[PDB]
Structure 1
Amino acid sequence: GITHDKMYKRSKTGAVQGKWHKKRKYNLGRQPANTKLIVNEGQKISTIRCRGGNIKRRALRLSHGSFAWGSADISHKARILQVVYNSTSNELVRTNTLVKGCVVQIDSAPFKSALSNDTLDKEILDQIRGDHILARISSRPGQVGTADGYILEGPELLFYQKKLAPK
């Protein structure tokens, strides 16, 4: 099946090597999870029997995760509304596919329920008084079956705002 063995590649000089054995089970891969944001249908997580009896769980559909505000040391569970930027490709954003590094929009209710009454970063307050906050995904969906992350702040937040402003 799918494999990542190097026997099927070329040499540094661009030459064909030649195959000297059949395919082996250490060098195998699997079809990507393609985790979809929900926006019969519900949180669906499957399990995979890996090498040595280990268990690897990949998520197919999900909608909630744990997020943090490092500067204010605030951490709660929120709902992810949609994905809005991804460096790798725009197709993933249109299809709302969850992967590490995707910039998402979360709801503000769990945070505004306790914020807007303490001196903090101005921009985070502006997001809080709205209906969504810019955040990022830090976990690896498809390997641990979870979608955690942290709230943006600083130069990177400016970078992403400048990137998605014209749209």
Structure 2
Amino acid sequence: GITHDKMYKRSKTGAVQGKWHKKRKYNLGRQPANTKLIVKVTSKKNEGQKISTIRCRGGNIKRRALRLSHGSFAWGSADISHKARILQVVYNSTSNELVRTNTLVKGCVVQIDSAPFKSALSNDTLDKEILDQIRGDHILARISSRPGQVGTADGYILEGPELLFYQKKLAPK
């Protein structure tokens, strides 16, 4: 019964708009997916990453992710891409309450294990700052994929002014 029609909403003036129809299955919206992480592998290993699949109007299926673990992350200015497990979620624009639960949302800044990206550090002088993150086992990456709309969490390693901005916000914690 969750619906995205504007029949139940007011006008520009703020006038009540009379309802002329009952709910439509063409206007329905499904409940939101909380894409948690398998962060605590100790007691979360008992549930492998699970991606559900929901039928949609047209019969086309949208895979929706319930629990995720790893996604393709790419260092663009180095052309180094590897599948990396997501260690932790930090700093979301929508709410920092989400960050506590680790629920993944497109645009959340995550931390990924640098062990897959180890070869790039040995390759000489790739960028500068990102190399230090590879030397320490945590690299910041933004999830660029919508978990729950494709059931995947791929992303990009943060670089440039964006990396600095995110780090500055996360400096005290």
TM-score, normalised via structure 2 length: 0.92
SS at match of 2:48: coil
Contact 1:116–1:129 (Cα < 8 Å) also in 2: no
Partners in 1 of 2:120 and 2:14 — Cα distance?
61
Runs (4+) of structure 1 moved beyond 2 Å? 113-117
Q: Aligned match of 1:68 in 74, 88, 113?
A: 74
SS at match of 2:147: coil
Q: Does 1:23 align with 2:23?
A: yes
Deviations 1:77-102 (A, max 9, x none): 11100101111111110000001000
Deviations 1:11-59 (A, max 9, x none): 1111112111211111001100110011x41111111111111111100
Deviations 1:96-136 (A, max 9, x none): 00010000000000111442341221111111111111111
Query: Which structure 2 segments of 5+ residues have no match?
Result: 39-45
Partners in 2 of 1:93 and 1:138 — Cα distance?
16
Query: Which structure 1 segments of 5+ residues have no match?
Result: none
> What is the number of equivalent residue pairs in this alignment?
166
Partners in 2 of 1:23 and 1:99 — Cα distance?
29
Partners in 2 of 1:160 and 1:52 — Cα distance?
40
Task: State the identity %.
Answer: 100
SS at match of 1:162: helix
The equivalent residue for 1:146 is: 152
Deviates more, 1:70-79 or 1:13-22: 13-22
Deviates more, 1:106-115 or 1:94-103: 106-115
Deviates more, 1:72-81 or 1:110-119: 110-119
Structure 1 residue 9 displacement after superposition:
0.9
Contact 1:116–1:128 (Cα < 8 Å) also in 2: no
Superposed CA RMSD in Å reads 1.0
TM-score, normalised via structure 1 length: 0.96
Q: Aligned match of 2:136 in 130, 137, 140?
A: 130
Partners in 2 of 1:13 and 1:133 — Cα distance?
49
